[PDB]
Amino acid sequence: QETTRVLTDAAINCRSDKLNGLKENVIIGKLIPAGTGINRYRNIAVQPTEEARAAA
Amino acid sequence: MLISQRPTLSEDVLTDNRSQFVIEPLEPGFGYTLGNSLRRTLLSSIPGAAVTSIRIDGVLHEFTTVPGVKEDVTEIILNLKSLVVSSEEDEPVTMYLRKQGPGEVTAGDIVPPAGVTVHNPGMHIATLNDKGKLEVELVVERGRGYVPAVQNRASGAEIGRIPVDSIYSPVLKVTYKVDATRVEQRTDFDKLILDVETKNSISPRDALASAGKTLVELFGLARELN
Amino acid sequence: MLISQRPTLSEDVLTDNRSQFVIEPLEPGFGYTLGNSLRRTLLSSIPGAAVTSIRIDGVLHEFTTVPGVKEDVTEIILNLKSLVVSSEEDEPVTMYLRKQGPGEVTAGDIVPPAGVTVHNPGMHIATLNDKGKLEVELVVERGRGYVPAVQNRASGAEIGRIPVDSIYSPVLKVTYKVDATRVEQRTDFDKLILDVETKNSISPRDALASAGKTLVELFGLARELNVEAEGIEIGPS
Amino acid sequence: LPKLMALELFKPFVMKRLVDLNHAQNIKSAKRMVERQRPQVWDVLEEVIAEHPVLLNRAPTLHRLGIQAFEPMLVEGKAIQLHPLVCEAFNADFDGDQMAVHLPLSAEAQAEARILMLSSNNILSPASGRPLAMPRLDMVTGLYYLTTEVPGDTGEYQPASGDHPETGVYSSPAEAIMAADRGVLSVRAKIKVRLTQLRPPVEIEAELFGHSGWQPGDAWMAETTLGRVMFNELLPLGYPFVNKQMHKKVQAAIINDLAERYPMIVVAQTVDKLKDAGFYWATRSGVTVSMADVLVPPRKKEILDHYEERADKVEKQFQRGALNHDERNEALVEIWKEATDEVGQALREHYPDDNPIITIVDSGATGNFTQTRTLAGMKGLVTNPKGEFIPRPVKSSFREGLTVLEYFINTHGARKGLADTALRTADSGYLTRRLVDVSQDVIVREHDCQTERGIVVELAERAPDGTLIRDPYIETSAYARTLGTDAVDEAGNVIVERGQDLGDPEIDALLAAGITQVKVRSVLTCATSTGVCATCYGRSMATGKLVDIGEAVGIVAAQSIGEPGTQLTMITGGLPR
Amino acid sequence: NSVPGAPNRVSFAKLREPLEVPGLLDV
Amino acid sequence: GGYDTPLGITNPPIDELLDRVSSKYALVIYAAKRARQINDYYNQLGEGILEYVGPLVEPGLQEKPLSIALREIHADLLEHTEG
Amino acid sequence: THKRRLSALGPGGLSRERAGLEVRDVHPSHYGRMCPIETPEGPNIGLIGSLSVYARVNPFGFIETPYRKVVDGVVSDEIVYLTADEEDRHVVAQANSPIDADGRFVEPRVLVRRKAGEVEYVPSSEVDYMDVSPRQMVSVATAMIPFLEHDDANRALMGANMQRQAVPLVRSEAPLVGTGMELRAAIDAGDVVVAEESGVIEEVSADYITVMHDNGTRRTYRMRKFARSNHGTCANQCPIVDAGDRVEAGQVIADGPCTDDGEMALGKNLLVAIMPWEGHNYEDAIILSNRLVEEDVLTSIHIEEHEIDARDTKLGAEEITRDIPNISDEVLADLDERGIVRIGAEVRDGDILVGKVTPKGETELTPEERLLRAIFGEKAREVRDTSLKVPHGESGKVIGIRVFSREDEDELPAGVNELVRVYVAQKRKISDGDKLAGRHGNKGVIGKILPVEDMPFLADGTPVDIILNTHGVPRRMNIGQILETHLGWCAHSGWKVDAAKGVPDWAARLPDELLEAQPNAIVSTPVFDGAQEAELQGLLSCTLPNRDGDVLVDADGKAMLFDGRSGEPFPYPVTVGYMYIMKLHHLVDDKIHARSTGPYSMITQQPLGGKAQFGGQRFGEMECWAMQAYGAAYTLQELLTIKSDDTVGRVKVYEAIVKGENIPEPGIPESFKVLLKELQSLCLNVEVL
Ligand SMILES: [Zn+2]
């Protein structure tokens, strides 16, 4: 509703925003923070166990 | 101990296309089984011959009728369905009828050529006025049991033609049961009591034969085959 | 008339007297028609030398257990019951084994004389106590299919040979069923399932052979009646 | 798998495939042939059919469950080909309905699926955690039937020695199986036997072995009805043994129990297998229906009567302008109520045990003793289509049949609730919905808020002479619970210790701790600043296990929460209140 | 009754209506 | 573990699988990353190829890369850890 | 139904967004006014209806119930159209009520609605008026199935509305049983060619028939066929008799549609029975024969009109030739001289249609092409190659030809000079799974098709029509289904009261006359009137045992067929019977859809759903929430992007796809991008970092 002022205040506030409320993600669209999609996770550090690779 | 004595194959004279069946001794335990089974069979490719699709004069799609009639191209069609002309050999066998004057679409009327025998060759089917003329161009067939009306497109039979189903299964209806003797002191077995009827194109045998055949047939495999 | 296809044995080896199979291609729908029955059939078609409403010794009212021996007939009996009695003299045959001094008792502890054998003789049976001895009254006999411990015909006339059981059917169980398959092509044609349980004595496969035989033999009749039949075909080999 | 379905759809796949068997040119080539619609299609069509998940739903929505992904296999018709439980669970009944479904895509996703709504994966009451899709009704009922004994039977164990043996005792199974098969008995009907593999429950083995009741061998005696035996046979091998008949629940409870003890998998394997056996019996058993079945409340009337004069007379009494129209009007009503019960009971009472009907419900199958009476005898009361009841009421019954009136009164609220239905359905979620958001995001921080402010607990309502008494609702709580601190024994020690889920066993020996509180790393005391910590939360029942790094129970519960509203009525009652 | 092409779907009239079927439709 | 036998799909049992590692998430993903890789390999395969090895264990028909991965996965051949 | 249908809403009328249930509310009065039961159904019941039965309505919008205006144990054999009111003043007598053959209801006391419709008892001696029959605030449709008094109104009205949704397949049948409503109802079809004169017959043939209006006088009264419904159905209108016979005005002449032997053909008096079976009549599940096929029992055909205009505009207009660009041959080797083929012609999907065509444009191409065309001399034309082609689930034979020209004067909308509209047959040969049913609301999907054999079946062989799970009715109510069906086999099978020596007591009464049933024959009963149980029951006892004077049937309801498969006996006796039903204007093609892709809102390029389109189902938000309950992210996200309207990946990965490769990983909410812009827009600038 209104928001409007809810607009103002902002630049007033000049704030940024936690950017977390999934809805956010929803908002943006940029995928959620969790579920299938997480930092730690989605930044995994993966690859084969050598030996096998060594095994060529 | 162990005991045997091959049972007692024996049909049971009855109506037309129809005389029961009885046999034993019978492994104290089973009857039904093959009882049905067979019965379950039967129904089995009751192989037969008969039409397929046909046609006549200006007989386009099925969605008018001929004058003189009181009738419907279709149910006509149906009625036809009632067919009952056991033929003979193999091929897209056919036939052709015509009419004139007061028309009376019954059975018994057309050109049953070679190896072609109706069974109620008269079976009314419809009728037309004194204008009750017409022809019919009619494509028999052999086969067995049902099949869906082909696509004459996928097929090719001319425009007026009308693919149809078949049902080559001259049987009528089955029924029977056991009677397992089995006397309660150890010394027992089953008792056979049977019957069906067909669509008056054969005797119980005939098929019945086919039965025993494809059966035994059915089992060479089943045998020690390996 | 011919298949335009052709089901086919599928051997499956599981155990000794248990192991599955199937056979296919399988136009719908007959496993029911067949197997099933066959389940019967075979099930039904299974000759074997089954025992006899037997007995042993002075107990015609010690109607439970015995000295020098801890077990009890019932126990004994299923233990009794338990047997790979392979034999031949299609008929009776009392048979007698004993042993004083304790120890215990397995199968072959006795003698299967003529046309009669064991397949388990280690088949323990009797754990002796106070060193007891005791021969035992035992007959067996063949046939297809087990026969129940019918109220034996002595109606008392017997010395105690108890209206026991006896399986003329050396088989041991069955399993199976139907499988609709290949549809676009073989417009969903049946698919088989063929396990079933025997005695050690033989493979399914075996009398199975006979089964299909046997089995057909019947049909011969129906079949053999007017060869003028259109009995649909497989093709040869 | 209505084939011509994504048959139609899938396409673009092979669309890149196809000419891979260079049989089209471009794709318009194929494609355009997709217009051609060519036997070849059905083929590698097959390939692409390669284990590919599926998108699925019928709305509405109640919660995450009501959807999953799967693998089918093409078939004709045009509707859809399913499972039971998948039903119910996913509710929608073959009243004439449908669903919604789409293309699993990014193996990213599809993956996701097999991970997730993977048919399997999908289990119990993740909200209320406890079990879910158990067999049921028919399935069950057939259960009951089998499960349910049949004393006074053929072959029925014969403790008739003294003149020869007794019989009913049987080493192997197929044994009398094979037999009785041999028309000789209806398993339902105890006798005697033995085992070696179908382990006994402990007790048995408890002494037979104590050391090891393993039945990978060691024969163990036996004796009952098979059937029940049958089932058994079908069960957690590693499990000892059961016996008896059981109820839907029961069973279920177990069941739950069962997998609880173990991994996914299997579970169904059985499950299915089970229903199957039923199914069989289902078909088996045999219980069509009869008007004949219309068992008859005897004197019944005379009771009626009774009430009639009761009121009646009373009618005269008020009639004297005695009191208010109502009150008396009630007492009247009461009178009825009285009847209500009486009729139902003694009615019921009368009929013999076996009437599948009731037996059904009786089988815990469903239904109610209302349906019971209601059905026949009387149908009881009715209320103002606007409120208060109906000064009649429902003397006769359907089965009996009645005039207009009556039914012509059914009519009203008939319309109404009906309507309600049409509403609670509506406002329900929305209500929720607001529920839906309200919070969200509110999820996991971590494992260990690291607070120290869980609360001791009630732990049953203890007791005087009874020493100890259990809140039922204990259970409602009591579990997925954190050793907020260290379960000490009766002073004697600290029976257990801060930080644990406090599972049944806990519940059980600790149960034997005759005590009634334990501080517990709940959560509302979540030290985790934002979000939450495992320690705080910890295990999902939905998991039956610990939670994860960041989790949306807010959903969940939110579902869990709203959804169930689902079905309530009614200083206010349902929701609004 | 009063039916030219009438057959009889024999019914269970325990009763009587001197009245008979209006024409509705009229309306 | 004498339970039974999976079926492509049911192949294999996460129950196991799961055991390998904690959160289903990456884990799966993880696999994602792989197959992705796999594909790539195949994606690239025919050409002045990249080093890209695998799919280690031999193939299995159309087998979704997906699987494959799944295989050497429970086959247990690579490593990882979040980010 | 549509007729008599009645409400009070809409133009100037109510707006359901404003009306208290009361609007829908019950109330006394109501009787003899409109079907208590039926109504709308969605948020809709209590909103609309019709009349009850008889009572005409005021020269001023108010019912006109006449009544058994009684007089001194001697009702005044007299209508009294009544506006409830008035009346209201008066005394509520009771139809179903035992008079001393004189008005003299033989009891001293009775009941009766009062001031508040106070359905109040009372001493017979006092009313002014009784009634006009039983059963009246009823509806026709209401008026349709007995056993009511045993059956769910809910379930009822359900079936009520249901009732309609039959589908005049083909065969023509009537429930051997059924009240009198029926054609005497059906007659109020007032449709069937039906007599006009006591004239002797005259020349006859399926178009009409000459009619010896015995005044010499005649008139080849007509008869229609093959002409669509609002719903794609023939004009069929089947005859009756013989060009020579002799009959009389108002009597029948020829059915046609819902018109079994002069009568709404409406279902199939059909065996089947009671089991819930192998889980296939479970959860609404439904287990179904097959012979049926073969039998055919289940089909008619259905009618689209098929249209496609010739237009006029900028670059030219919309020609309809038969020439075409690089069209296949046959594809053309088929239509008429200059487009579409010829009546009664078979097809399939895709199938091109029109002979259309239109100017294409004028905006160059790559030399590349042309060149190319020069490369292959395929000197392209330049006209918007345009026409029509058959979509999906579509075939049959040519029909319509409403090819109507503007140009040919055939007035038509702008920029067009003509248009045809055409039709094609298709005999719908009934899929299982689907749904049908009959009376007792007792709806029923159509689960599985099932070959004959393989089928429980008479000990006398003959198997089912299908079978029936159990369970519902209990928590449902409608068992007449049971009874009625008992009945069914009965009638179907006939009998005779062996009353002989004396009287089947319960007999001792009733339409005596029956005494028997010539195994199978016409059978009605009253609504709130019909025999009883015991009787009925005892009727059970009665019989017309078969051929082998047999009755596999039990004086009990449960016999014992065996298995058309495994075959053996059963556990216990077999409940069974018969039931006419009806068939459904609601199945797959009614709703058989999805959508791979197609059009997309030239604005919100979403799946431009449409005819050509499958719509492409919309998606819900909960749902999303479900995701959440997992978090497949992507997935959803994806969606949002993908099938949502990801212009790119759509294109892009669409490619990928095309190139089948570790897909263009999910990008960015793009558009969203816009935003920003959108913001800025208002001095809004900001940012994350
Ligand atoms: Zn925490």
Task: Examine the domain organization and report whether C77 and C56 are in the same domain.
Answer: yes
Cis peptide before G123 (omega within 30 of 0): no
Amino acid symbol at B219: F
**Helix (H/G/I), strand (E/B), else coil: G659:** helix
Residues of C in contact with B220 (CB under 8 A): 212, 216, 234
- Positive or negative, the CA dihedral B120, B124, B130, B133 is negative
Element spanning F18, H or E: helix F14-18
From F3, F8, F64, residue closest to D107, measured CB to CB: F64
Please give the helix or strand (H or E) that residue D230 lies within, else none.
helix D228-233
Question: Which residues contact residue D100 at a Cβ distance below 8 angstroms, ignoring those fewer than 6 apart?
Answer: D55, D56, D57, D58, D59, G617, G619
User: Are residues B66 and B162 both part of a single domain?
Assistant: yes
The alpha-carbon gap from A27 to the nearest alpha carbon of chain F, in Å, equals 24
CATH of the domain at B210: 3.30.1360.10
Q: Where are the beta strands (DSSP E) in chain C?
A: 9-11, 21-23, 86-87, 104-105, 116-117, 126-127, 145-147, 166-168, 173-176, 194-197
- Of C131, C149, C168, at which residue does a domain stop? C168
**Chain G residues touching B40 at Cβ < 8 A:** 453-454, 564-565, 567
Tell me how far apart the alpha carbons of residues E12 and G510 are, in angstroms, rounded to a whole number.
7
Cα–Cα nearest to B121, from B200, B188, B58, B42: B200
Domain-wise residue ranges, chain F: 1-83
List for chain B the helix, strand, coil content (%; round to 5).
15, 20, 65
Residue D541 alpha carbon to ligand 1 centre in Å: 18
Q: Tell me the residue range of the domain where B81 lies.
A: 48-168
Cβ-defined contacts of C61-68 (< 8 Å, 24+): C63/D161, C63/D162, C63/D164, C63/D165, C64/D161, C66/C132, C66/C134, C67/C129, C67/C130, C67/C132, C68/C102, C68/C128, C68/C129, C68/C130, C68/C131, C68/C132, C68/C133, C68/C134
Secondary structure element (H or E) that encloses residue C143, with its range: none
Nearest CA in chain C to B30: C40
Question: What does residue G165 show for φ and ψ, rounded to 5 degrees?
Answer: -70, 15
F33 touches G: beta carbon within 8 Å? no
- Relative orientation angle of helices G534-541 and G483-493, to the nearest 10 degrees: 40
Which residues of A are less than 8 Å from G670 in CB distance? 29
CA distances from G217 to C209, G211, G223 (A): 86, 8, 19
Q: In whole angstroms, what is the distance from residue D136 CA to residue G559 CA?
A: 27
Q: What distance in Å separates residue E2's CA from the closest CA in chain G?
A: 10
Q: Angle at CA D148, nearest 5°, toward D144 and D154?
A: 135
Residue F52 in tokens: 């890209």
Is the CB of residue C7 less than 8 Å away from at least one CB of chain B?
yes
Amino acid D460 reads A
Judging contacts by C-beta atoms under 8 Å, the chain C residues touching residue D233 are none
Specify whether the CB–CB gap between B108 and B123 falls below 8 A.
yes
- Provide the residue type at C81 as one letter: K
How would you class D112 by CB atoms within 10 Å of its CB: exposed for 0-12, middle for 13-18, buried for 19 or more? buried
Please report, as a single letter, which amino acid is at residue G92: V
Same domain, B56 and B17: no
Cβ atoms within 10 Å, residue G269: 22
Q: How many residues does chain E have?
A: 27
Alpha helices in G86-239 (DSSP H): 153-164, 181-186
Distance of alpha carbon G479 from alpha carbon G146, whole angstroms: 10
Residue C189 CB neighbours (<10 A): 19
Residues G459 and G553 sit within 8 Å (Cβ to Cβ): no
Cα end-to-end span (Å), chain A: 63
CATH class for domain D137-284? mainly alpha
Partners of F29 on chain A (C-beta within 8 Å) are: 36, 41-42, 44
Contacts of F14 in chain D (CB under 8 A): 121, 264
- As to burial, measured by CB atoms within 10 angstroms (0-12 exposed, 13-18 middle, 19+ buried), residue E17 is middle
Strand G306-311 to G416-422 pairing: antiparallel
Q: Which residues contact A45 (CB under 8 A, 6 or more apart)?
A: F80, F81, F82, F83
Same domain, C221 and C177: yes
Report the binding-site residues of D for Mg(2+): 93, 95, 97
What is the CA D276 to chain-centroid distance, rounded?
A: 17
Sign of the dihedral defined by the CA atoms of residues D563, D569, D571, D576, in that order: positive
Only one residue has tokens 């004009």, namely G235
Q: In whole angstroms, give the CA distance from residue B107 to residue B82.
A: 9
Chains C and B touch (3+ CB pairs under 8 A): yes
Residue A10 to chain F, least CA–CA distance (Å): 33
C158 shares its domain with C191: no
- Give the nearest chain G residue to B73 (CA atoms): G206
B7 chain-C contacts, CB cut-off 8 A: 218, 221
**Is the Cβ–Cβ distance between C76 and D171 less than 8 Å?**
no
Q: Which two tokens stand for residue G383?
A: 């006209």
D295: left (phi over 0), alpha (psi -120 to 50) or beta: beta
The owner of tokens 């100890």 is D468
Distance of residue A4 Cα from the nearest chain F Cα, in angstroms: 39
Residues G499, D227: Cα–Cα separation, whole Å: 49
> Residue D115 and residue D125: Cα distance in Å, rounded?
18
User: In this complex, do D269 and F4 lie within 8 Å of one another by their Cβ atoms?
Assistant: yes
- Is residue B69 located within the same domain as residue B28? no
Report helix, strand or coil for C191.
coil
Residue ending a domain, among C108, C140, C168, is C168
Burial of G500 by CB count in 10 Å (0-12 exposed, 13-18 middle, 19+ buried)?
A: exposed
Residues of G in contact with D286 (CB under 8 A): 275, 570-572
Do C42 and C208 touch, CB atoms closer than 8 A?
A: yes
Single-letter amino acid code for the residue at D12: P
Question: In chain C, which residue's Cα lies nearest the Cα of G450?
Answer: C29
Paired tokens of B212: 């025993």
Residue that is written with structure tokens 């009963």 in the block: G525
Q: Chain D within 8 Å of G643 (Cβ-Cβ)?
A: yes
Q: Do A35 and D552 touch (CB under 8 A)?
A: yes
Q: How many CB pairs lie under 8 A apart between chains B and C?
A: 158
Distance CA D221, CA D312 (A): 66
Q: Which amino acid is at G65?
A: T
Backbone dihedral angles phi then psi of residue B163, each to the nearest 5 degrees: -50, 155
> Which amino acid does the sequence have at D64?
R
Which residues, at least 6 apart from G371, have a Cβ–Cβ distance to it below 8 Å? none
Run of H or E residues at A10: helix A4-13
Helix axes of G636-645 and G647-659: crossing angle, nearest 10 degrees: 100
Contact C108, C85 (CB under 8 A): no
Instruction: State the CATH number of the domain containing residue C63.
Output: 2.170.120.12
Q: How far, in Å, CA of C219 to CA of C235, rounded?
A: 19
Q: Which among B38, B45, B225 has the least Cβ separation from residue C9?
A: B225
Residues in chain F: 83
Give the three-class secondary structure for G457. strand
Q: Do chains F and G touch (3 or more CB pairs under 8 A)?
A: yes
Please tell me whether residues C207 and C164 are part of one structural domain.
Answer: no
Which chains border C (3 or more CB–CB pairs < 8 Å)? Answer: B, D, G
- Ligand 1 centroid – CA D456 distance (Å): 17
D442 at the A interface (CB within 8 A)?
no
Residue G417's CB is within 10 A of a number of other CB atoms, namely: 19
Claim to verify: residue C78 and residue C110 sit in the same structural domain = yes
Q: What is the CA radius of gyration of chain B?
A: 23
Strand ranges across the sheet with G200-205: G200-205, G208-212, G221-222
Domain boundary among C168, C197, C226: C168
Distance D517 CA to ligand 1 centre (A): 21
Count of the separate structural domains present in chain B: 2
Considering the domain architecture, whether residues B88 and B130 belong to the same structural domain is answered as yes
If residue D128 lies in a helix (H) or strand (E), which one and from where to where?
none
Whether C140 and C184 map to the same domain: the answer is no
Contacts 24+ apart (CB under 8 A), F48-56: F53/A48, F53/A53, F53/A56, F54/A48, F56/A48, F56/A52, F56/A53, F56/A55
DSSP one-letter code for G644: H
Q: Please say whether the beta carbons of C167 and C140 come within 8 A.
A: no
In CATH terms, the fold of domain D300-422 is: Topoisomerase I; Chain A, domain 4 (1.10.132)
| D538 CA → ligand 1 middle, Å | 9
C145 and C56 within one domain:
yes
Give the best residue of B45, B63, B76, B79 to mutate against chain G (max G CB count within 10 A): B63
For D120, the closest chain F residue by CA position comes to F10
Say if residue C112 is in the same domain as residue C176. Answer: no
Other residues' Cβ atoms within 10 Å of the Cβ of residue B64? 18
* Other beta carbons less than 10 A from residue G407's beta carbon: 12
Determine contact, residues D535/D520, Cβ cutoff 8 Å: no
Q: Hey, are the CB atoms on D165 and C173 less than 8 Å from each other?
A: no
